[PDB]
PDB file of C-alpha atoms in Angstrom:
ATOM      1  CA  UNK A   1     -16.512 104.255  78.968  1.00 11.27           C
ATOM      2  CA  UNK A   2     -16.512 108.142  78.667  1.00 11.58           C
ATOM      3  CA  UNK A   3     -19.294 109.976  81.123  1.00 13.19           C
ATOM      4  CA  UNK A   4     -20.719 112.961  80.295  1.00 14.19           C
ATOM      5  CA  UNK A   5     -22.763 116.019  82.507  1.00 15.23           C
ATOM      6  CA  UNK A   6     -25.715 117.125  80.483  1.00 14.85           C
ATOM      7  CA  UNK A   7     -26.616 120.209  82.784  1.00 16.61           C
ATOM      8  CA  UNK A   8     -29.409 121.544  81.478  1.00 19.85           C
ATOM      9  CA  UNK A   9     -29.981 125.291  82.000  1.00 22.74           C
ATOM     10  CA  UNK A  10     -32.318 126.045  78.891  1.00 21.79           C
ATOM     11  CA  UNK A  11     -32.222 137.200  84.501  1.00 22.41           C
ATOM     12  CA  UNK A  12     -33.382 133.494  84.980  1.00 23.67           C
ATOM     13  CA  UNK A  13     -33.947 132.000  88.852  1.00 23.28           C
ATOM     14  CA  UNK A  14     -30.910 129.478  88.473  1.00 23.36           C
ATOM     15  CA  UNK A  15     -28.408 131.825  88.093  1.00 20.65           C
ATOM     16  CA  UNK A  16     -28.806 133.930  91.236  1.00 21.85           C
ATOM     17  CA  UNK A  17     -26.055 134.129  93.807  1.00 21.54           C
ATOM     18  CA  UNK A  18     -27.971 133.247  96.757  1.00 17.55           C
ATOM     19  CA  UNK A  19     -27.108 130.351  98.069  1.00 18.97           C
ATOM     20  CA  UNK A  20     -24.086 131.150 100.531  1.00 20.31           C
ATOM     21  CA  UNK A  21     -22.603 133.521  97.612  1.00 23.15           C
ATOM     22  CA  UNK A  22     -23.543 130.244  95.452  1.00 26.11           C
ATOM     23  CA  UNK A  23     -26.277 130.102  92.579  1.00 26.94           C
ATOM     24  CA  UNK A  24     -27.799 126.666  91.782  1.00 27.08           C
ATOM     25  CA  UNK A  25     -26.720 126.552  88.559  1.00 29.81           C
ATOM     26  CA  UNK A  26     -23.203 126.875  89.802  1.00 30.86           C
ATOM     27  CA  UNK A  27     -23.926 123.924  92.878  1.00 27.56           C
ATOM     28  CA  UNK A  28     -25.385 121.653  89.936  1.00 27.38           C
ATOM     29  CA  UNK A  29     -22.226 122.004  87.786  1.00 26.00           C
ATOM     30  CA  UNK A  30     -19.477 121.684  90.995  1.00 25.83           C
ATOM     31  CA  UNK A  31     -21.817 118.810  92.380  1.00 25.62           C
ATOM     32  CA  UNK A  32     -21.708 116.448  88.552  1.00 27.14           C
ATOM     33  CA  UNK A  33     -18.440 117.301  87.488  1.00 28.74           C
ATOM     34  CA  UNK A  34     -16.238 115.168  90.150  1.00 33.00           C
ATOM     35  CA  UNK A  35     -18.300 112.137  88.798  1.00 30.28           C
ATOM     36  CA  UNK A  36     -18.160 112.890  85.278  1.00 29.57           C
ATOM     37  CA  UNK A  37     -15.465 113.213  82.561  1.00 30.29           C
ATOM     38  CA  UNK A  38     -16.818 115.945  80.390  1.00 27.60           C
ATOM     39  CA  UNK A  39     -19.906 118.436  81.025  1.00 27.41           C
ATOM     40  CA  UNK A  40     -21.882 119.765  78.356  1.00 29.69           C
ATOM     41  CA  UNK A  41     -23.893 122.777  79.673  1.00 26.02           C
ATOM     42  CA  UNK A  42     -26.944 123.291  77.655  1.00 25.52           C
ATOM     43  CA  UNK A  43     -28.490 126.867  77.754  1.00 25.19           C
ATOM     44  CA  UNK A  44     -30.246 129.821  76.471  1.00 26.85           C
ATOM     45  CA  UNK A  45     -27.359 131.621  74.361  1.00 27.90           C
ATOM     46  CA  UNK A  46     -28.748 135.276  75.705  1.00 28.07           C
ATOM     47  CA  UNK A  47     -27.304 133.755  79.011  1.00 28.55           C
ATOM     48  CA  UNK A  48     -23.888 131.989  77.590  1.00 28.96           C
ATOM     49  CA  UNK A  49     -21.400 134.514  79.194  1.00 32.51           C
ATOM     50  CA  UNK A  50     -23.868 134.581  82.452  1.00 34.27           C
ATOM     51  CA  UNK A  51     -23.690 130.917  82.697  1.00 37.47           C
ATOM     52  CA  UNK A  52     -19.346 130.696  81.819  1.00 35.44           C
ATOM     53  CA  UNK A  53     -18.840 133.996  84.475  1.00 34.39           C
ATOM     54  CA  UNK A  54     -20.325 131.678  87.156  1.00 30.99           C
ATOM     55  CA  UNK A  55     -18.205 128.652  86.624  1.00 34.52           C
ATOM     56  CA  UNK A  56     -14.982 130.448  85.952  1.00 33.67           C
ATOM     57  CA  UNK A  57     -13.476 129.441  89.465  1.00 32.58           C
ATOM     58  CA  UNK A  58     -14.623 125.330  89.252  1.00 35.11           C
ATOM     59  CA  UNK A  59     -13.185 124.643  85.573  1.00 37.65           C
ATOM     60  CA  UNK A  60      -9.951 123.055  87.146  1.00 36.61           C
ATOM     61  CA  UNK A  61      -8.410 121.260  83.868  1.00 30.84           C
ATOM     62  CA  UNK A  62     -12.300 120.103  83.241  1.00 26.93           C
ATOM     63  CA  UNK A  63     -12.858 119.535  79.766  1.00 27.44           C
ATOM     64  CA  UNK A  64     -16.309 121.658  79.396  1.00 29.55           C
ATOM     65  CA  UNK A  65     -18.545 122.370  76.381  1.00 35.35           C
ATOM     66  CA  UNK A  66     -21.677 124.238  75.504  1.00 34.74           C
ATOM     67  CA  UNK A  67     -25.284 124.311  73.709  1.00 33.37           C
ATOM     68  CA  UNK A  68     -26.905 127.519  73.204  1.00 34.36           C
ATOM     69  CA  UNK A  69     -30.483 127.504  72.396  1.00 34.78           C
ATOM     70  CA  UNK A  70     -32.082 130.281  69.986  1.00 31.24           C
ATOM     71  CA  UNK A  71     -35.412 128.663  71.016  1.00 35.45           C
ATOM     72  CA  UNK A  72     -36.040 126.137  73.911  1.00 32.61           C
ATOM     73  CA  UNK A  73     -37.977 123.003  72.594  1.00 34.36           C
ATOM     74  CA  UNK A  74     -38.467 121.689  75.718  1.00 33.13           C
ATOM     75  CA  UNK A  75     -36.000 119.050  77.541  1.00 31.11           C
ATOM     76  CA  UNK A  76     -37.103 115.581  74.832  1.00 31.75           C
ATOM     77  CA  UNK A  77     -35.389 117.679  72.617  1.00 27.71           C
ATOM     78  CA  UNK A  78     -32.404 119.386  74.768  1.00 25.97           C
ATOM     79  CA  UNK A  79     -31.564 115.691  75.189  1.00 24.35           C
ATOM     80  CA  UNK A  80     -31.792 113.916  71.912  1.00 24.22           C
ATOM     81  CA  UNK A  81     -29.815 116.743  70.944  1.00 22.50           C
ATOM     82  CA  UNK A  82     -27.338 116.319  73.387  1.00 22.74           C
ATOM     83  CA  UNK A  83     -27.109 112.071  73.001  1.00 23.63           C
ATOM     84  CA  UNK A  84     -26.782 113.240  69.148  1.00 24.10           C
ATOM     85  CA  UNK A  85     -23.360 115.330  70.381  1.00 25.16           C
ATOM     86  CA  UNK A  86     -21.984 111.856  72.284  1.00 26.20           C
ATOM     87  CA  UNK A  87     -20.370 108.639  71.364  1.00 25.34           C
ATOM     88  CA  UNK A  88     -23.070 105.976  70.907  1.00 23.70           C
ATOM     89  CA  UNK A  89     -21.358 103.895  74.058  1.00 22.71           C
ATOM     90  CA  UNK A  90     -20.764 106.902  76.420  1.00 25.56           C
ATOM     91  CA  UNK A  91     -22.435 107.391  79.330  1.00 26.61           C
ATOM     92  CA  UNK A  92     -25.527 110.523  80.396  1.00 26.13           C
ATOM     93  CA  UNK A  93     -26.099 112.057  83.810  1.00 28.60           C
ATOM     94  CA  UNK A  94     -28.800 114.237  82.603  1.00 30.25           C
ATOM     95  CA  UNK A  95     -29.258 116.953  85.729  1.00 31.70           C
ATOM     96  CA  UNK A  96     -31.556 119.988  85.442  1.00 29.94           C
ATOM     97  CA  UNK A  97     -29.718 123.028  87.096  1.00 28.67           C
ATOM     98  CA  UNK A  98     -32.456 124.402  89.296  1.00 28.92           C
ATOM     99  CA  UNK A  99     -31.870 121.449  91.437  1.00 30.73           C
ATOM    100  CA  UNK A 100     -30.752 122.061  95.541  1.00 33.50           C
ATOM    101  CA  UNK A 101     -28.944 118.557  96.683  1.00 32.02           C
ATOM    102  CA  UNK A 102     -27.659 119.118 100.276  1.00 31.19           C
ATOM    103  CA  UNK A 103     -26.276 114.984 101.218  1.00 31.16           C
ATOM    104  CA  UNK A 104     -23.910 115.131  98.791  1.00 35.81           C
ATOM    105  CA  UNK A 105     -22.841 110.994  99.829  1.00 32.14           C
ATOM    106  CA  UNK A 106     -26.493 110.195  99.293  1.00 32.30           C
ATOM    107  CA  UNK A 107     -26.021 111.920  95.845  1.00 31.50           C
ATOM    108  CA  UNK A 108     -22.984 110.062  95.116  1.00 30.61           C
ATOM    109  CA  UNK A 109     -24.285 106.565  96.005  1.00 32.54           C
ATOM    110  CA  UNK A 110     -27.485 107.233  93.632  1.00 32.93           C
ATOM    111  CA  UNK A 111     -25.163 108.420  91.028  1.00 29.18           C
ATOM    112  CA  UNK A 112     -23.194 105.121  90.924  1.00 30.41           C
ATOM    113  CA  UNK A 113     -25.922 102.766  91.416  1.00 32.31           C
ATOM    114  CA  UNK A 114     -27.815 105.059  88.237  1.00 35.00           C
ATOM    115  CA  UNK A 115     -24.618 104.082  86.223  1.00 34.66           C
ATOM    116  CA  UNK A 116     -24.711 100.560  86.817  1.00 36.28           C
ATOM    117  CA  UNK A 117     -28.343  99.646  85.917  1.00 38.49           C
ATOM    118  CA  UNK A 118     -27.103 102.632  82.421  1.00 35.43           C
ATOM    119  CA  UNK A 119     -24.323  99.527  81.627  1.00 36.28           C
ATOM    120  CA  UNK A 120     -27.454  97.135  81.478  1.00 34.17           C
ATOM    121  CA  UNK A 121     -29.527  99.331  78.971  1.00 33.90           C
ATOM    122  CA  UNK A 122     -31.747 100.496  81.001  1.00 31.42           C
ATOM    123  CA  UNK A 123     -33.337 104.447  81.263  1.00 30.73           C
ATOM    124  CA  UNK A 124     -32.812 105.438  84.662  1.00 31.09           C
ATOM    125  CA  UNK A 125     -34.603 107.872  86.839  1.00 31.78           C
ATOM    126  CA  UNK A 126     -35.130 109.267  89.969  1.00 32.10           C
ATOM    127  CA  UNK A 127     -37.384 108.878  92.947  1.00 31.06           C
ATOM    128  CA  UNK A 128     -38.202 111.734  95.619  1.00 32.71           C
ATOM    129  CA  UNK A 129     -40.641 110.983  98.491  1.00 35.58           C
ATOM    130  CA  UNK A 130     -44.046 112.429  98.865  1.00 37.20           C
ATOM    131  CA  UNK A 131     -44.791 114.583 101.151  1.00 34.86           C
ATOM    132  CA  UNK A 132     -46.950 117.653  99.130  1.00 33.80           C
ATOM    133  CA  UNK A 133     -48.913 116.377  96.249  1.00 34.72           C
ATOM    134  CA  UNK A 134     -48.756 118.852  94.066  1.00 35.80           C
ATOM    135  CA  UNK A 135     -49.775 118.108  90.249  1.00 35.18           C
ATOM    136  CA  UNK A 136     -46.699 119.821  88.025  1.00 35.45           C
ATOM    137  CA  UNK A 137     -44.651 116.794  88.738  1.00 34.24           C
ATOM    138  CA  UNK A 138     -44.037 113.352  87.425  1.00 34.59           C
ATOM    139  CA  UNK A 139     -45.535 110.633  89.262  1.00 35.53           C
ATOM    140  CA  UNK A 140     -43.366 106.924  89.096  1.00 37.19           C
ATOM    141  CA  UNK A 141     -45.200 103.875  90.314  1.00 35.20           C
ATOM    142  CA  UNK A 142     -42.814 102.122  91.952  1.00 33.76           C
ATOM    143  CA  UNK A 143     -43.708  99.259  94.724  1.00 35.43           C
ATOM    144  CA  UNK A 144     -40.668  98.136  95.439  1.00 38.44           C
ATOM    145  CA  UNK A 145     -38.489 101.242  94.873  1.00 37.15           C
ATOM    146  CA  UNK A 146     -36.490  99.592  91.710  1.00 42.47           C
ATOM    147  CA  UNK A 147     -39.248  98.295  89.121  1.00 41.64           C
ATOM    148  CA  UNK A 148     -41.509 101.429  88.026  1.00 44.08           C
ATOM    149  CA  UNK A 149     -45.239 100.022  87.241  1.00 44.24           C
ATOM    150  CA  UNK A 150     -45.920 103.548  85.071  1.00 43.25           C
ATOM    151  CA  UNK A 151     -45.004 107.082  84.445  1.00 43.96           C
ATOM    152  CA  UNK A 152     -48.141 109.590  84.837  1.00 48.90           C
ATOM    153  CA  UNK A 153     -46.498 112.965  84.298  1.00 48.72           C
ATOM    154  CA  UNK A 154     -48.678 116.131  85.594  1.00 46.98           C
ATOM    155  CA  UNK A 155     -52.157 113.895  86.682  1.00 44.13           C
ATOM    156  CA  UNK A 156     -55.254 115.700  87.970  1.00 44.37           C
ATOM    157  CA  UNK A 157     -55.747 116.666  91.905  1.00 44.14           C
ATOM    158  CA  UNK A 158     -57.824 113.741  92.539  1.00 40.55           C
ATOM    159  CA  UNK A 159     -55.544 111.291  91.110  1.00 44.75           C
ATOM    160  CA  UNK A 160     -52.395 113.273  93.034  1.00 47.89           C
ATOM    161  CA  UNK A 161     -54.087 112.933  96.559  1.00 47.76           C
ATOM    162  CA  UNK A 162     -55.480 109.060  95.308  1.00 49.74           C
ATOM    163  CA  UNK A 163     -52.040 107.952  94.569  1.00 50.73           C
ATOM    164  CA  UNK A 164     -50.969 109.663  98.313  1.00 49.88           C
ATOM    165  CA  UNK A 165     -53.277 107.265 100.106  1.00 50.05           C
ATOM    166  CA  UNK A 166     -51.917 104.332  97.881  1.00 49.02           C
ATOM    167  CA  UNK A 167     -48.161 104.490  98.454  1.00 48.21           C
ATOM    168  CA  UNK A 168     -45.089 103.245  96.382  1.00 44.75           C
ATOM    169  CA  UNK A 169     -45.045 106.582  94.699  1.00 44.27           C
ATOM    170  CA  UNK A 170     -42.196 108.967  94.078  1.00 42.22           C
ATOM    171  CA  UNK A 171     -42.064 112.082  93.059  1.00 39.36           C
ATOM    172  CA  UNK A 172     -39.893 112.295  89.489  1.00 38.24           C
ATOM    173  CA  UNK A 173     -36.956 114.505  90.146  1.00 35.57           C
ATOM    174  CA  UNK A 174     -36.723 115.138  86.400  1.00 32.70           C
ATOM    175  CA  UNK A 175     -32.704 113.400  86.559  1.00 29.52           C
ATOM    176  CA  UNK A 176     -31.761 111.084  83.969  1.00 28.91           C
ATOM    177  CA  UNK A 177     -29.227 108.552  83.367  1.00 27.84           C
ATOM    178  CA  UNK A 178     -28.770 106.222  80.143  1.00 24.85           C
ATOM    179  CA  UNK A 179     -26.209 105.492  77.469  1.00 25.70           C
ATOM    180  CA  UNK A 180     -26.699 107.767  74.495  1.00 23.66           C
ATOM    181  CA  UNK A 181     -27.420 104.835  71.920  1.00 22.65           C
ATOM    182  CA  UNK A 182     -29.849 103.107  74.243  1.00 24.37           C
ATOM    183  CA  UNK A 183     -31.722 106.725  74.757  1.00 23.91           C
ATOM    184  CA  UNK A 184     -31.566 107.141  71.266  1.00 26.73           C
ATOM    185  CA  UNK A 185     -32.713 103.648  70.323  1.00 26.35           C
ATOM    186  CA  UNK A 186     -35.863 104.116  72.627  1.00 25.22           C
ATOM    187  CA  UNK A 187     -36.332 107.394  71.111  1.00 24.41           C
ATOM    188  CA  UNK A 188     -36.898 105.819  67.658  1.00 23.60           C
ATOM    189  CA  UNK A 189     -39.014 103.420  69.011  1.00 22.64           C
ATOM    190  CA  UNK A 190     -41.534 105.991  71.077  1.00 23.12           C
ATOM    191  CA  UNK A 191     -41.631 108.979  69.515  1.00 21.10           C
ATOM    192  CA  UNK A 192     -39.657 108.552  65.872  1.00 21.86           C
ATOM    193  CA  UNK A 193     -41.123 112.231  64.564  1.00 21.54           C
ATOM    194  CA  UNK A 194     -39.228 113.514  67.472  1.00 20.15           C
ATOM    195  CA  UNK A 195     -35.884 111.616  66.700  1.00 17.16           C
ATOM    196  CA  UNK A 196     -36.527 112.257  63.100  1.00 18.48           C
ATOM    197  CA  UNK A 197     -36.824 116.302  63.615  1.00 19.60           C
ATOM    198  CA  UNK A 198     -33.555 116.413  66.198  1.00 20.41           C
ATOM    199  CA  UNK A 199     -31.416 114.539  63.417  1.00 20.25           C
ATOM    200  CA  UNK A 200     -32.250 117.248  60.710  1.00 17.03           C
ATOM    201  CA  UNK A 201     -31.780 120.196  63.066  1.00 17.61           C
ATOM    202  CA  UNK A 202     -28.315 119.017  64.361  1.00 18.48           C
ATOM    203  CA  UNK A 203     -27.763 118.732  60.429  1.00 19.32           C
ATOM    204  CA  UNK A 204     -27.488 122.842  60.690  1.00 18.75           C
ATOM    205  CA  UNK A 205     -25.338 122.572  63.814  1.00 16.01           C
ATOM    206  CA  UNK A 206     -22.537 125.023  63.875  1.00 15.32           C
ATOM    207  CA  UNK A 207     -19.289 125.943  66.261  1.00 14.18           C
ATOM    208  CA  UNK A 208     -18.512 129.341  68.102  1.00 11.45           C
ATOM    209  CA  UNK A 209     -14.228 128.509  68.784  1.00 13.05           C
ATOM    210  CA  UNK A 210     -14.156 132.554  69.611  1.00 12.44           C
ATOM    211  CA  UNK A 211     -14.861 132.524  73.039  1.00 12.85           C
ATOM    212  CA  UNK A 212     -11.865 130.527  73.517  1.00 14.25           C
ATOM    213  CA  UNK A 213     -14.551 127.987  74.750  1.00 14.27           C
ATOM    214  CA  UNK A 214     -15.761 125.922  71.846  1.00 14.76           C
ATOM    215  CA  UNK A 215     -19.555 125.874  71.378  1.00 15.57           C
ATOM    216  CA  UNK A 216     -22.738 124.586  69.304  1.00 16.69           C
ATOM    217  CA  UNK A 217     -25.802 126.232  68.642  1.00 16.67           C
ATOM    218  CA  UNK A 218     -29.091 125.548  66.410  1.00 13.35           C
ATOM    219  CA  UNK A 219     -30.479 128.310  63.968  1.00 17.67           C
ATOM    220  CA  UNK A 220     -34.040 129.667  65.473  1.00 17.47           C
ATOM    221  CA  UNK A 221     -34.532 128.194  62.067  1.00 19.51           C
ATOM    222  CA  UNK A 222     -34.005 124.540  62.370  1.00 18.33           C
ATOM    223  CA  UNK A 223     -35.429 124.597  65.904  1.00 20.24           C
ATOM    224  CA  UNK A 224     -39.099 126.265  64.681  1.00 20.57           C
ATOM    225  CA  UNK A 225     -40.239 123.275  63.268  1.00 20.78           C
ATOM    226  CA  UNK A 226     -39.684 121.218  66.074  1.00 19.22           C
ATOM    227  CA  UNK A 227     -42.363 119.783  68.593  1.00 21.75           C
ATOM    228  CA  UNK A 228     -42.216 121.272  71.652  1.00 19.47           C
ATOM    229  CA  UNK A 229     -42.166 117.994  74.066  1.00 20.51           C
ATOM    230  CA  UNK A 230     -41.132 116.923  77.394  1.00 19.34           C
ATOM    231  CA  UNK A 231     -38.909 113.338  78.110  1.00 25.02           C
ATOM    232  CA  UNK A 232     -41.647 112.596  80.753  1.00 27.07           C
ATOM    233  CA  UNK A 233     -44.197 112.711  78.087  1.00 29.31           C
ATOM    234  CA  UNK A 234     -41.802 111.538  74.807  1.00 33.02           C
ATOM    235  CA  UNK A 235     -40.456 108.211  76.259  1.00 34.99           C
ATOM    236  CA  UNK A 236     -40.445 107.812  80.039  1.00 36.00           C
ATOM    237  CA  UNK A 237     -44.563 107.837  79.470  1.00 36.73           C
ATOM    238  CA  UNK A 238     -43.990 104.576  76.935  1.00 33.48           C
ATOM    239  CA  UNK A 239     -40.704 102.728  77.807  1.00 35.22           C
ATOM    240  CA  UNK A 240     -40.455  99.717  78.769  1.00 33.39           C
ATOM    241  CA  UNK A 241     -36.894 100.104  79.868  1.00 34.79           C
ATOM    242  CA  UNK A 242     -37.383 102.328  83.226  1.00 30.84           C
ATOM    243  CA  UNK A 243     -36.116 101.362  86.609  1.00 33.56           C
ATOM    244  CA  UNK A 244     -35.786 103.970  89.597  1.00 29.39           C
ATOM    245  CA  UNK A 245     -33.238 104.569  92.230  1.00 26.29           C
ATOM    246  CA  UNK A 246     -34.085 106.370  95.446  1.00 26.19           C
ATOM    247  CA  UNK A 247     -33.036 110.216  96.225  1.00 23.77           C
ATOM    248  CA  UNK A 248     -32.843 110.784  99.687  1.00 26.31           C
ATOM    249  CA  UNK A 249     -30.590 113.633  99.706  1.00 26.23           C
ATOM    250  CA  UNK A 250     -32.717 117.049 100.836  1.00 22.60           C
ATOM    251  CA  UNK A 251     -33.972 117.409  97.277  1.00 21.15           C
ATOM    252  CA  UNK A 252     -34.874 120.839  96.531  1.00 22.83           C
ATOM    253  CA  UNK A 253     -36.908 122.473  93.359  1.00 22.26           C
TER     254      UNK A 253
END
């Protein structure tokens, strides 16, 4: 089984050098590509050759491949698009690129455990401890740290500081992993409009091989009509097929 990086990126704070001489976008790629087999970096294309000058030095023989977005459509749609570019049977690490992971063993332990429940066909995600409620997060239910009893993505104040008190609730770090097919069966179960409208605008996909680096990208065209939508509130709001694994690893957004 093939596993494949979808970093997604779509003068933007991610690409900043700051970090030690680092940007995060940069720490996200090194930090996935020893556990994966191909990346595919999906990004705004105004910041293509921003994103390729920063991994220049850590493409060593790695077998990497863009998506440049016209128009962002939110990440539902980044990653149906993305599962639409894959074999049915390989394997997703979806990781946004904003993301600062310091325990880098603690990140690697997640990451295999993630892949095993993946070969089971289930939707994996990823749990960060409480310690600030604030309300532009996901929320996962989970009492025992495996078995999610909901997703409530973005809740109000009351209900952010109500589920403090309760306990067995995680923080969602907005990581994903899942086998394309499985993702893309659960897609046409829970939102089918949105499946539906990601098939017809990969139908007007198209490749950049100047470059040297091979790339896709969308027409602003085929990505208007599309429904702007988040995965939290697309599927991981309505699956039934959710279990969590723990992140205790200095998670940073």
């Amino acid at each position: 089984l093939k596993i494949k990086n979808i970093l997604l990126s779509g003068y933007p704070k991610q690409f900043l050098k700051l970090f030690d001489h680092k940007s995060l976008f940069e720490l996200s790629f090194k930090r996935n590509a020893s556990l994966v087999d191909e990346t595919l970096i999906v990004c705004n294309e105004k910041h293509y050759f921003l994103a390729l000058e920063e991994i220049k030095n850590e493409i060593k023989n790695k077998s990497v491949g863009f998506l440049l977005e016209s128009l962002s459509k939110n990440t539902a749609n980044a990653i149906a698009l993305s599962a639409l570019m894959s074999d049915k049977e390989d394997l997703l690490i979806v990781t946004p690129s904003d993301h600062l992971i310091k325990d880098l063993q603690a990140y690697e332990n997640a990451i295999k455990k993630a892949i095993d429940l993946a070969q089971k066909g289930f939707l994996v995600t990823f749990g960060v401890s409480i310690d600030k409620p604030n309300t532009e997060f996901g929320y996962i239910e989970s009492p025992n740290g495996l078995d999610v009893k909901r997703f409530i993505e973005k809740p109000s104040l009351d209900k952010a500081i109500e589920f403090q008190k309760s306990g067995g609730f995680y923080f969602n770090s907005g990581m994903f992993v899942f086998q394309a097919g499985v993702f893309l069966d659960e897609l046409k179960k829970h939102a089918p409009t949105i499946l539906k409208g990601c098939e017809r605008a990969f139908e007007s996909l198209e490749n950049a091989y100047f470059f040297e680096k091979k790339i896709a990208r969308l027409s602003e065209k085929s990505m208007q009509d599309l429904e702007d939508m988040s995965i939290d509130i697309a599927l991981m709001q309505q699956s039934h097929k959710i279990k969590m694994v723990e992140l205790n690893a200095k998670w940073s957004d």
